[PDB]
């Protein structure tokens, strides 16, 4: 009876094959992200040169945090918070932006904060509080084999793949993003920056689209 190491052979080797694919893949994304960033930077600069104005594409992806408790909430916003999977205070999820979701966001502005997450905060959300749903059962990511067993079907066979799918809002954003459990955040550590949460961001309050300022919040809450 071999197997002792003689099927540990196949396994150890094949695991190495896989990290290899993950290495080349993660080095790829890094390139991808850099040149994406730089191109827009040079877009903005080229246009100024030409006497013109470069208007960025609109954001395709937002990140929504529920900011309001569980009591006295009218029924329409209530169903939407559920459909967006926000059923408890400070939990959060990603939302791909289209008119058909935009209007959901509209309907819940009083109870959530949201904005456009950067790579850094999507990366750190997943690395630290990223759990898959697996026969339900909320399972921590912690190892890449968990991801590939469940999302490998869509390509996507590592944690940084997962991230790449989210941030680019790839072709399988539905499956990728449903896979992530709603992120369970703490209260911001700095605090909220406001005396009263339940006004819009714009009125010195806390809710609504605060655009890129979402990252400072989330980080302080993560």
């Amino acid at each position: 009876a071999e197997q002792v190491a003689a099927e540990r052979a196949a396994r150890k080797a094949a695991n190495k094959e896989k990290r290899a694919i993950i290495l080349e893949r993660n080095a790829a994304y890094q390139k991808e992200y850099e040149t994406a960033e730089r191109n827009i930077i040079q877009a903005k600069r080229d246009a100024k040169a030409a006497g013109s104005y470069y208007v960025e594409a609109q954001h395709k992806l937002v990140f929504v945090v529920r900011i309001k408790g569980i009591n006295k909430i009218p029924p329409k916003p209530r169903k939407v918070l559920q459909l967006l999977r926000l059923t408890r205070i400070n939990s959060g999820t990603f939302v791909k932006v289209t008119k058909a979701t935009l209007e959901l966001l509209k309907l819940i502005e009083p109870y959530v904060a949201y904005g456009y997450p950067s790579y850094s905060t999507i990366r750190q959300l997943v690395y630290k509080r990223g759990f898959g749903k697996i026969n339900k059962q909320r399972v921590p990511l912690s190892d890449n084999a968990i991801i590939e067993a469940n999302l490998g079907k869509y390509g996507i066979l590592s944690i940084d793949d997962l991230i790449h799918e989210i941030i680019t809002v790839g072709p399988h954003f539905k499956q990728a993003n449903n896979f992530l459990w709603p992120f369970k955040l703490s209260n911001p550590s700095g605090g909220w920056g406001v005396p009263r949460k339940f006004k819009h961001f714009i009125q010195g309050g806390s809710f609504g689209n605060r655009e890129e300022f979402i990252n400072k919040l989330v980080k302080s809450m993560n």
Binding site: G69, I70, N71, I73, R78, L81, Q82, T87, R88, I89
Partner: protein, 185 residues
């Protein structure tokens, strides 16, 4: 807090064991839960659950209903399985061979079957002959034949049989039951 969206702490609603207190029944269940866990045969899962069933949900299968099934196209050599009792039926005159496996055979069912050179088999003899239940024909009896369900859904125009003790004219057959006595149902 959690805006819940379904009852918490909710039992699945399916028997999990039988409610019966019978050793032998409990042993057959030992058999088939093992069989269900360790083979991917659907047959074993079905049978498991049927043993849990209460008496109502196990109507008797008759030997004539058995005969009918064996008349199915490509089915005469199948070994039929009844997870319940099998009753006799003088209404058929010519009964085939086969092998029936069941929880119980009445005196006369066993007779009818055996006299045609058939074979009555317990569910565990069944298990050893057909661990993946190969070549088997599971029959259930008529649940909604029961006298009780005559009265389920009673209400105007539903056409469904009074809960009544004595019957005859003069027992619930006047006002509301005919056009000429107030109205009809």
């Amino acid at each position: 807090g959690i805006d819940h969206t379904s009852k918490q702490h909710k039992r699945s609603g399916h028997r999990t064991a039988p409610k019966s207190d019978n050793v032998y029944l409990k042993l057959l269940v030992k058999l088939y839960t093992f069989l269900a866990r360790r083979t991917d045969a659907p047959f074993n899962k079905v049978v498991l659950k049927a043993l849990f069933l209460s008496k109502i949900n196990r109507p008797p299968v008759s030997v004539s209903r058995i005969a009918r099934a064996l008349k199915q196209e490509g089915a005469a050599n199948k070994t039929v399985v009844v997870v319940g009792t099998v009753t006799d039926d003088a209404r058929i005159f010519e009964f085939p061979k086969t092998t029936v496996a069941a929880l119980r055979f009445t005196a006369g069912a066993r007779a009818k079957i055996v006299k045609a050179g058939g074979e009555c088999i317990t569910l565990d003899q069944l298990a050893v002959r057909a661990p993946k239940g190969q070549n088997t024909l599971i029959l259930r009896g008529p649940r909604n034949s029961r006298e009780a369900v005559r009265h389920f859904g009673m209400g105007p125009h539903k056409g469904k049989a009074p809960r009544i003790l004595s019957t005859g004219r003069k027992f619930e057959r006047a006002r509301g039951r005919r056009r000429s006595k107030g109205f009809k149902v």
